[PDB]
Amino acid sequence: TGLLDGKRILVSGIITDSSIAFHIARVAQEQGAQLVLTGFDRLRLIQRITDRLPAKAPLLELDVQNEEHLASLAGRVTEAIGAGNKLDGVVHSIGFMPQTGMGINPFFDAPYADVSKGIHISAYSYASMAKALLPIMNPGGSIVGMDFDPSRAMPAYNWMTVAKSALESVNRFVAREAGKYGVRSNLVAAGPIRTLAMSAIVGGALGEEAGAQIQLLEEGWDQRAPIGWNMKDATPVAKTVCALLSDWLPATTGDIIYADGGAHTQLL
Amino acid sequence: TGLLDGKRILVSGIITDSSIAFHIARVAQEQGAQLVLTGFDRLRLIQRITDRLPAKAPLLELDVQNEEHLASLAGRVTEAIGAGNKLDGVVHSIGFMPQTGMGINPFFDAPYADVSKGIHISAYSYASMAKALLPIMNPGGSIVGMDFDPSRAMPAYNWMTVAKSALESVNRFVAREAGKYGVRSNLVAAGPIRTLAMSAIVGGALGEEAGAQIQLLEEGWDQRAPIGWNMKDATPVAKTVCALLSDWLPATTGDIIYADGGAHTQLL
Amino acid sequence: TGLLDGKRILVSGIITDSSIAFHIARVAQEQGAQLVLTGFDRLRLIQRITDRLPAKAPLLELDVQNEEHLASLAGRVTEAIGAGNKLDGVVHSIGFMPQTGMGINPFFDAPYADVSKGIHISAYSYASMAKALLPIMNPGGSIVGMDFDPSRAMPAYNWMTVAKSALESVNRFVAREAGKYGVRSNLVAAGPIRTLAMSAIVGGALGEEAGAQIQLLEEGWDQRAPIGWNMKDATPVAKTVCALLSDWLPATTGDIIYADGGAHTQLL
Amino acid sequence: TGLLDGKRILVSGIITDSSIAFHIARVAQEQGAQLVLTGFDRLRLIQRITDRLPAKAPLLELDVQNEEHLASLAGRVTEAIGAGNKLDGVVHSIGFMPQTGMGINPFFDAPYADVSKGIHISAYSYASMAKALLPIMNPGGSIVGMDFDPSRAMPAYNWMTVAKSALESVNRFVAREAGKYGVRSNLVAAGPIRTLAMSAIVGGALGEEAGAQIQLLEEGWDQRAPIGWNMKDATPVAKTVCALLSDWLPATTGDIIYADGGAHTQLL
Numbered sequence A, B, C, D: 001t002g003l004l005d006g007k008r009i010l011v012s013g014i015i016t017d018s019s020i021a022f023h024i025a026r027v028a029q030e031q032g033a034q035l036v037l038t039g040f041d042r043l044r045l046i047q048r049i050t051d052r053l054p055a056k057a058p059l060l061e062l063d064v065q066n067e068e069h070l071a072s073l074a075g076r077v078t079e080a081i082g083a084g085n086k087l088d089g090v091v092h093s094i095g096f097m098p099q100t101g102m103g104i105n106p107f108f109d110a111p112y113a114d115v116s117k118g119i120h121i122s123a124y125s126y127a128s129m130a131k132a133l134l135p136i137m138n139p140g141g142s143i144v145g146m147d148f149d150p151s152r153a154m155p156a157y158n159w160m161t162v163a164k165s166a167l168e169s170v171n172r173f174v175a176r177e178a179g180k181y182g183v184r185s186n187l188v189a190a191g192p193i194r195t196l197a198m199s200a201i202v203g204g205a206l207g208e209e210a211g212a213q214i215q216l217l218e219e220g221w222d223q224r225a226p227i228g229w230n231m232k233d234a235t236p237v238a239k240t241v242c243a244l245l246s247d248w249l250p251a252t253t254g255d256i257i258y259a260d261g262g263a264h265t266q267l268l
């Protein structure tokens, strides 16, 4: 029963009950899929959040920057799901970029060390995580990551935009690799979703002469979207993810599926 | 059980059991959706082909060039689906181009009358159907067409390629009109499927020359595709359509989904 | 002396002293190129306008819909420039779309006969004109036409948008043909330029509930353009055209060169 | 006489007389522009190569990874060009990637440190230069980088491909900052030019395998290109750059111009 029924899927990126990856896992569980979650430093905290999901799932630690963690993932996962078992899905919902390369800080003022860190976590980790779990996946599986259309320049997104441009390109390579094991790799470009990381800027954390820019940006989205767009509700994005983790899109790979309500296909 | 369980969907484009619509209709029904099929002219002859379907679905006549037909369309679907009842999806699997604008004929040598009719049936009927059927579709329902990625020139496809460009363009506007009803409009860029009216080409009826040209595009498609491409299995495509018909991609319109084995994302 | 010095170029589309093609020809002449202009019905009128250019150029008649005119062009041109002479450039600045398929009239209400007419003149004529003049061009030559980015749907442009989508695709085919004679074919996407055809709507010819839409559309352009954008000045577009007709872009073909001040590369 | 007559332009990226920058510098000078060249480390060794240039142009040292250099850049160009005098254009012909992220090494097998440096030198230095040189450039002046179309995965190019994606993305933002000065920022997607550090590859130093892989991409490029492609003539490219440096494309920024013989616009 369910869309992902019987599939064992790895979800990551969770940190709050408001982050997209949390809703993905919740929908994946509601669709009878069995999970394995990976989290960052505040494991003690992430533990609490996951203790809200409709069902229990082992929670492993995963700093994408720790090449040592990566060297143990496949094993640990093998423990989580059990011998004689393989993964059918891998979801990469991880992003990082110092405020030096996003918010209000000028584009030319982000030092490389900060940018390189963001790209390492936002772009590179997609390839290495795919390098870690590829070997324990069943042919016919789906790896999928989050994206935010970097097609055209926009205010404040600055370097996180460059990282995303570099994520799509990497996604196309991971796919010719993944395709060897019969696995599909795709990205999902979502519109903006009022998550916690931004839940603070909502009141003016970045100020007026900027906190207004991002604002007119989001409104433009529902404005442009033929079917509208509520940014305070991730579900539409999560269902799209689930669709990609299922078996009803087994001919699409190395692609980008836009879950933005058609905004990117309309100018005004 | 079923991905489209309880969805009343219209499928057009069927002529032979080889045609893609037949496989879209098939997978659609194995997943519990109620259908309505439309045929062009040799009506009494396609019943023999839709009689080889899982379930019995009424067949209405629909010649997209005939304005009379279009106008009577909606009333005719009701007479079939049920008073007050609506459609959840409509599939446009209609493509036509005189050999004078496709195959072996030179590009500059196609009369405009032949091109006009190829576009009229290939691009414009998409806006026509949607115009007729929009008023009797459910919110959250969806429309979907068949595409063949024309982002690049290629031998033989010629004016059909230009017809598809317009389709992608026409699709973006249909979504805008479809939004005022909460309906989705998307296209599926299929890979090359050896259909009846296509397997002959390689058979030699195109000549030595062109018969080798076409083979190169195919043989080189499965080569580009990371998870390969079986040119004679419309299932991966039919399954992608059904997916776009479900509620699992509720946030994407005026867009193109590639069920081409990832072959458009690789240069080699 | 000049950029196009010595080149014999064919310019078309002129109708007023405000239309883009007029400014193209003016800049082409200012750059020491010798012209041949083709015009539509009001030849008596177009005559006056051209009698403003910095120099005299024969003015031939050319209805792109008259297959008979097309069958005589190469000859007539041969007369204009003289035996032993060939064309080095061809500029297609021609566009048409009934008000039934552009302005305020809904997208679903444009009948095919009107659309087909627009596409015939906006899309198809590019191929047939290239079919007419290709044979009298010198290898190393450039054919170029006007475009308005049809990448994403927009209000009011409706069917003229579909025609343009179909122009870019045709441009890619004309190029593999043109490439046989060593000729390059490219399109130039310009931002909006307050020409006469729209000089009327400026005051409210289309009304408020629409004449305001197109307005916020144009302002968005200068807003988005990193280098600004004055719509009441064609020159920037004309210089771009000249650049394409010269010999400093002999490796680019079947392309689209955007002369919009970078607006299409910026979201907000 | 000259397309860039009276334009003071900076050209970087020269190491051998084979390198593309040398040909960009050459054609630039034959067209009357005054130049400033920057070299990386074996300085005293490239003077021998820039001494084979039409005219004597000062050479400054510029290691894009060195912050000290960057900071002293602008002051150093003045010491060369003249007090109160400015630059009209800046050419970025800089690309680098450890063999561990390009050629024969597997894709998942490239350490991040090697990728970080390839991006730092391939993508980020573009924003760096522009940041240093922007304050001393003339309005209407322009900046231009070298690109290699990464819209699709391909064998061997691997992480250099991901580095170029970021370049195209970085370029869109540079134009936004460059607009506040009336400067243009564009990239030239060159076709494959057999450079010194590239002709060896086919020579066998890549091995039998990869040495055939690379050949296929090349041999199949001139095949796709409608006006063909001479992989060992950087002139068509150099001439496209100079064009982007002139005032004949004053309305295009944050964009990519393909001097690839039209090879990206054909599927076969």
Ligand SMILES: NC(=O)c1ccc[n+]([C@@H]2O[C@H](COP(=O)([O-])OP(=O)(O)OC[C@H]3O[C@@H](n4cnc5c(N)ncnc54)[C@H](O)[C@@H]3O)[C@@H](O)[C@H]2O)c1
Pocket (backbone or CB within 6 Å): A012, A013, A014, A015, A016, A018, A019, A020, A021, A039, A040, A062, A063, A064, A065, A092, A093, A094, A095, A096, A121, A122, A146, A147, A148, A189, A190, A191, A192, A193, A194, A195, A196, A197
């Ligand atoms: N907010 C939007 O509208 C939107 C739209 C499209 C895509 N995305 C992308 O989706 C992803 C997650 O979005 P989110 O909105 O749920 O934000 P989020 O802040 O809630 O989650 C991002 C997560 O990144 C993980 N992370 C950070 N550094 C890490 C590291 N070194 N190692 C391992 N994990 C690390 C954390 O567990 C963190 O909570 C990101 O990649 C993001 O850019 C967001």
Ligand SMILES: NC(=O)c1ccc[n+]([C@@H]2O[C@H](COP(=O)([O-])OP(=O)(O)OC[C@H]3O[C@@H](n4cnc5c(N)ncnc54)[C@H](O)[C@@H]3O)[C@@H](O)[C@H]2O)c1
Pocket (backbone or CB within 6 Å): B013, B014, B015, B016, B018, B019, B020, B021, B039, B040, B062, B063, B064, B065, B092, B093, B094, B095, B096, B121, B146, B147, B148, B189, B190, B191, B192, B193, B194, B195, B197, B198
């Ligand atoms: N075969 C492939 O490899 C492939 C690839 C990409 C896209 N497509 C697209 O898929 C769809 C179906 O392709 P197909 O290969 O199965 O071919 P098909 O010939 O079986 O189906 C096209 C159908 O068009 C319908 N049709 C023709 N003229 C019509 C009219 N006036 N009014 C109403 N209907 C009319 C017919 O019933 C016809 O059989 C088309 O839209 C086509 O361009 C096919």
Ligand SMILES: NC(=O)c1ccc[n+]([C@@H]2O[C@H](COP(=O)([O-])OP(=O)(O)OC[C@H]3O[C@@H](n4cnc5c(N)ncnc54)[C@H](O)[C@@H]3O)[C@@H](O)[C@H]2O)c1
Pocket (backbone or CB within 6 Å): C012, C013, C014, C015, C016, C018, C019, C020, C021, C039, C040, C062, C063, C064, C065, C092, C093, C094, C095, C096, C121, C122, C146, C147, C148, C189, C190, C191, C192, C193, C194, C195, C196, C197
């Ligand atoms: N206005 C803009 O902002 C803009 C931007 C980009 C591209 N364009 C395109 O540039 C071209 C011309 O633009 P314009 O602004 O100078 O407008 P324009 O109205 O001044 O010129 C278009 C011309 O089309 C020609 N024409 C029409 N029907 C014809 C036919 N049957 N046969 C031969 N010629 C015919 C006429 O001589 C006419 O004046 C069109 O193709 C247009 O869509 C316009």
Ligand SMILES: NC(=O)c1ccc[n+]([C@@H]2O[C@H](COP(=O)([O-])OP(=O)(O)OC[C@H]3O[C@@H](n4cnc5c(N)ncnc54)[C@H](O)[C@@H]3O)[C@@H](O)[C@H]2O)c1
Pocket (backbone or CB within 6 Å): D013, D014, D015, D016, D018, D019, D020, D021, D039, D040, D062, D063, D064, D065, D092, D093, D094, D095, D096, D121, D146, D147, D148, D189, D190, D191, D192, D193, D194, D195, D197, D198
């Ligand atoms: N050769 C081709 O076919 C081709 C195709 C498309 C794009 N390109 C691009 O064209 C440009 C030049 O290519 P090329 O083939 O002539 O190779 P090239 O090796 O001759 O030039 C690249 C140059 O990078 C410079 N460089 C390296 N590290 C540096 C540093 N730290 N600081 C400053 N400068 C540094 C050097 O002076 C070096 O010679 C690059 O940006 C490249 O990616 C080349």
Ligand SMILES: O=C(c1ccc2[nH]ccc2c1)N1CCN(C2c3ccccc3-c3ccccc32)CC1
Pocket (backbone or CB within 6 Å): A095, A096, A097, A102, A103, A148, A154, A155, A156, A157, A160, A192, A193, A195, A197, A198, A214, A217, A218
């Ligand atoms: O991808 C993300 C996103 C979400 C959570 C994250 N946690 C760590 C990095 C990170 C990035 N976002 C954030 C929200 N939007 C807004 C936005 C919408 C429209 C236009 C511009 C911007 C914009 C610009 C800067 C920061 C945030 C945003 C973009 C996507």
Ligand SMILES: O=C(c1ccc2[nH]ccc2c1)N1CCN(C2c3ccccc3-c3ccccc32)CC1
Pocket (backbone or CB within 6 Å): B095, B096, B097, B102, B103, B148, B154, B155, B156, B157, B160, B192, B193, B197, B198, B201, B214, B217, B218
């Ligand atoms: O869109 C169609 C298609 C489907 C049904 C049709 N009924 C009338 C015209 C028509 C075209 N096709 C058919 C099969 N392919 C092949 C093909 C694959 C790769 C490269 C070239 C071609 C190609 C060229 C000519 C005719 C058919 C095809 C393209 C999609």
Ligand SMILES: O=C(c1ccc2[nH]ccc2c1)N1CCN(C2c3ccccc3-c3ccccc32)CC1
Pocket (backbone or CB within 6 Å): C095, C096, C097, C102, C103, C148, C154, C155, C156, C157, C160, C192, C193, C195, C197, C198, C214, C217, C218
């Ligand atoms: O390509 C043209 C154009 C110019 C002159 C013409 N003569 C005959 C056809 C024709 C088309 N235009 C006209 C001006 N704009 C405006 C515009 C700008 C931004 C957004 C929407 C629109 C828009 C919509 C409808 C009509 C005109 C326009 C688009 C380009």
Ligand SMILES: O=C(c1ccc2[nH]ccc2c1)N1CCN(C2c3ccccc3-c3ccccc32)CC1
Pocket (backbone or CB within 6 Å): D095, D096, D097, D102, D103, D148, D154, D155, D156, D157, D160, D192, D193, D197, D198, D201, D214, D217, D218
């Ligand atoms: O961008 C570059 C380029 C230029 C200078 C450089 N210095 C250090 C790395 C580097 C890369 N190139 C080099 C030549 N080609 C070839 C090529 C053409 C088609 C397909 C694949 C490849 C390919 C693959 C690996 C190395 C070089 C190349 C790509 C552009």
